[PDB]
Write a structure and sequence with these properties.
The complex is a heterodimer.
Chain A: H1 10-19
Chain B: H1 2-8, H2 13-17
Classes of the chains: A mainly alpha, B mainly alpha.
Protein name (chain B): Insulin A chain
Disulfide bonds (chain B): 6-11
PDB class: hormone
């Protein structure tokens, strides 16, 4: 399903979803 | 970096998962 360019601030939306419970932001 | 990469190209799940904590 990772099928598209992620522009705007859609990269953090994608990371939020795919990284799930472990997260991604900061440390 | 990843912001530029994933806007100008289609990132894979591999590439995104490199940025998970």
């Amino acid at each position: 399903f990772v099928n598209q360019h992620l522009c705007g601030s859609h990269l953090v939306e994608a990371l939020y979803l795919v990284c799930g419970e472990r997260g991604f932001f900061x440390x | 970096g990843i912001v530029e990469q994933c806007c100008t190209s289609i990132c894979s799940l591999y590439q995104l998962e490199n940025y998970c904590n």
